[PDB]
């Protein structure tokens, strides 16, 4: 099945796929590239771009006097291991497309590209690159600048539903050294104790529930180690991260894990933390979701089960707006060899995106 | 303070230290290098090389009719890290010597060298190229021999002291996969789990108890997995060993910490096992160790504590023979960038043997 915002939508999208903004390195420009194709692309739209630095980039467009914005980030994840052909290049089969991107999150911007070009309807647009991570600057700037919106709808891989919740992120790089002062003088065997210790209270936090969404998701990441079987390791390195449920205590979790270290670990650095969503007094969440739903329900928009991955909605919802989770695919296929999304959701997407901007 | 005896040790070991047999690679010829410059230095002897492949050689040399066996391994561990200068260029200072291997072990070959150097007292040398590694093979194909010999002292650094016991070693290679059918889906996860019950395992043996030695050395030496903090770890490897005292049963041993990973680890293998010295049931570790006293004291050799680390006494002790390790030299520089032992160490030790070959 095809229709003709599906296709400018693909012809978008091929365009927006073949432009590298992978993050790292984030080598991404404010002249040239992916903007320049973008400011090109936004008739009747007053646009634009600021450099944050450092390949942090916005482009902020405004057509009319539009009461909702959505935010669509750019840059896509590192490309493989695995891909069977160029990550660049999009391709496509009878019922889908793939390429590095095409499901988080550029078929959301391709599809509201096409749609800025089909009507002349009233939309705003906030075009980010540094959402996947960490020294982030694009959202923290626009805040900063007090525009209002009665709602801020932020695209990721939600199978074309509104997503109303969501889990918080943490991540930290913990690093164990021996203490030849005994027990600790190993510092895998202090890893070994600390894990083991981690894990056990995360079981205790398992009854924890939210919108469907129960426990803490906990993971420890990496360990690195040692050298030899019997030759006692003096230094471990090990990256954990969580992702909190709403209204959970992040400050206390954090301090709690760095605790169950004995002795101290040697370093314990949280480099990335982002709110869930909402945030808050389980109150202030409930009042903010139940806000959230209702202007997904002025928007037609079906609401879908609340999500464990995180997003910038987080930060729209901190800031004091009323704020979502909405674009077409499946987080299942993020980050993945062969990335894809269905011409389905991309149709079903930029009809709905199409249907908010310029429907009657 | 130098002796005649000295010189000629400090020369031979200044020629033997020369000689690269880093063990990896374990690059070591039967013919040339180190093995031709003992064949040159033995007179008197009936001498013999066996090459048994793959850098595993022995040279076995008998002059008269000795009741001792006298055996020293020729290899050493690599090199670095740290090392200030050349390896193999023996260094000297006002009290002691630099080099790759002269302090394990050598020092000791050096030594009984010189001896054989000094008189036509009996005598019974095996050098062997294969201790510090994996796949030895001399001293195996040695004992297939059954040739008689009332004790035979195993060259490692025990300050000149006797040493009649010490602990048996294993070594372990595990992989834990993660299980996507959950709990288990997290390979780091296990290996966090097995690692807090091994742990506990071994404290539960801490009061066991063998000539001073106390509980189980036991040692998780590397662990690497997973790629990122909060990717979930398909596999991880963890490397760990554990050295038995006497009479402890290695085999239940090993299967208690098999058993502690639940679901069963992807990959167990016990990449080696020596037995501790003596070796078998308590009763016979205790006849064997006074023996092997007996035979210290005949020979005039102050007894030293029993060690923690590992030495082929073992191997020629569980094959029937009275066995005891004795070298110059402290346990302590042993693998170490600029390892040294002193020439205080050296003269003890072969004045020591001297006497045990050449005097009256």
């Known amino acids: 099945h095809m229709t003709d915002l ?3 939508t ?3 999208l091929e365009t927006l796929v073949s432009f590298d903004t992978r993050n790292p390195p984030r080598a991404i420009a404010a002249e040239g590239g992916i903007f320049d194709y973008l400011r090109a692309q936004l008739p009747g739209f007053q646009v634009e771009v600021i450099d944050h630095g450092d390949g942090a980039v916005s482009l902020y467009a405004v057509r009319g006097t539009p009461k909702y914005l959505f935010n669509v980030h750019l840059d896509t994840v590192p490309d493989s291991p695995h891909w069977s052909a160029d990550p660049h290049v999009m391709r496509r089969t009878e019922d889908r497309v793939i390429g590095l991107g095409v499901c988080d999150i550029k078929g959301a911007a391709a599809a509201l590209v096409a749609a800025a070009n ?5 939309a705003a647009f906030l075009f980010s690159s540094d959402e996947e991570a960490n020294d982030p600057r694009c959202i923290a700037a626009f805040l900063a600048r007090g525009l209002p919106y009665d709602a801020v709808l932020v695209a990721e891989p939600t ?5 109303l919740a969501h889990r918080g992120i943490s991540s930290v790089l913990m690093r164990f050294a021996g203490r030849a002062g005994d027990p600790a003088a190993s510092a895998l065997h202090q890893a070994m104790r600390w894990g083991g210790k981690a894990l056990d209270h995360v079981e205790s936090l398992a009854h924890a529930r939210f919108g469907g969404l129960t426990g803490l998701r906990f993971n420890i ?3 690195d180690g040692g050298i030899k079987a019997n030759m006692i390791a003096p230094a471990a390195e090990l990256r954990f991260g969580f992702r909190p449920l709403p209204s959970m205590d992040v400050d ?3 301090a709690t894990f760095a605790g169950f270290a004995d002795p101290a670990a040697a370093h314990f650095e949280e480099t990335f933390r ?3 969503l909402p945030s808050g007094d389980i109150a202030r969440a409930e009042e903010r979701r139940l806000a959230a739903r209702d202007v997904a329900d002025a928007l037609d928009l079906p609401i879908g089960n609340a999500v464990d991955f995180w ?3 987080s930060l729209f919802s901190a800031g004091g707006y009323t704020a979502l989770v909405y674009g077409p695919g499946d987080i299942a296929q993020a980050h993945t060899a062969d990335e894809f999304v269905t011409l389905a959701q991309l149709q079903r997407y930029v009809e709905s995106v199409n249907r908010i901007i310029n429907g009657s």
Chains 1, 2 share one sequence.
């Open 274 to 276: 982002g709110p869930s």
């Open 252 to 254: 206390g979790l954090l």
């Open 6 to 8: 599906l296709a400018s």
């Open 221 to 223: 990441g990496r360990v």
């Open 10 to 12: 693909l012809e978008h």
């Open 311 to 313: 997003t910038e909605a």
């Open 159 to 163: 199978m074309s539903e509104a997503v």
């Open 118 to 122: 089909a009507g002349d309807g009233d």
